[PDB]
Amino acid sequence: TVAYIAIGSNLASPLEQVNAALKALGDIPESHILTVSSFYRTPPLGPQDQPDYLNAAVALETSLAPEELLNHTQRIELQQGRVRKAERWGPRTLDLDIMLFGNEVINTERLTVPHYDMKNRGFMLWPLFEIAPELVFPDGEMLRQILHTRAFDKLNKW
Ligand SMILES: Nc1ncnc2c1ncn2[C@@H]1O[C@H](COP(=O)(O)OP(=O)(O)OP(=O)(O)O)[C@@H](O)[C@H]1O
Numbered sequence: 380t381v382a383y384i385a386i387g388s389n390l391a392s393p394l395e396q397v398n399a400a401l402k403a404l405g406d407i408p409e410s411h412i413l414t415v416s417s418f419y420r421t422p423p424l425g426p427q428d429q430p431d432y433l434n435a436a437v438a439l440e441t442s443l444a445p446e447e448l449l450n451h452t453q454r455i456e457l458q459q460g461r462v463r464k465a466e467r468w469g470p471r472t473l474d475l476d477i478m479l480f481g482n483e484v485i486n487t488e489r490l491t492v493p494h495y496d497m498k499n500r501g502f503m504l505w506p507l508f509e510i511a512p513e514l515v516f517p518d519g520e521m522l523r524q525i526l527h528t529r530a531f532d533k534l535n536k537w
């Protein structure tokens with residue numbers, strides 16, 4: 380299956396965090412990276428009192444089930460010092476989100492796919508568009524159309 384993963388980091392040298400994450404992602408069993416987007420430097424969306432983010436997107440081919448892939452992405456986050464609390468949108472060393480998993484629609488307590496807010500986030504959609512410009516969501520909406528329609532500002536590079 381082809382899964383699209385979003386990467387975010389705004390603490391403890393984001394470039395080192397993301398290069399380390401790419402290596403660890405390549406190490407997941409039964410999986411291999413297909414493509415990596417450019418690295419973008421984005422102002423925080425949501426709480427503004429935190430450093431700018433390094434955001435990227437990766438296409439991964441995997442034969443793991445969606446929740447098994449999650450187990451590995453959460454292990455990598457933890458390995459790189461991610462400590463979550465119920466208070467959610469603060470700074471973090473590493474954030475690995477599953478944006479899409481094949482054409483699956485998943486709605487469980489652990490996993491909501493497509494990512495519940497990705498159509499509202501330019502820092503997820505632009506990097507994704509760079510690696511999969513003709514992508515179509517499970518609901519039939521085209522990625523290119525969402526970007527053209529919403530007029531999201533373009534992103535700067537890291
Ligand atoms: N598509 C998904 N990718 C990653 N985690 C997900 C996904 N859907 C649901 N989750 C759940 O989200 C929680 C982790 O969210 P996290 O702390 O990293 O939030 P965040 O990424 O900082 O904020 P947001 O989810 O709004 O983008 C975990 O309980 C995980 O099970």
Ligand SMILES: C[C@@]1(CCc2ccccc2)Nc2nc(N)[nH]c(=O)c2N=C1CO
Pocket residue numbers: 386387388421422423424425426432434467468469474502
């Ligand atoms: C912290 C938040 C909050 C996202 C959010 C936006 C609006 C309402 C709720 C949450 N902001 C982010 N900003 C950038 N540039 N990049 C991020 O990766 C990013 N991620 C977020 C949480 O996942």
Ligand SMILES: [Mg+2]
Pocket residue numbers: 474475476
């Ligand atoms: Mg996350």
Ligand SMILES: [Mg+2]
Pocket residue numbers: 387474476
């Ligand atoms: Mg996130």
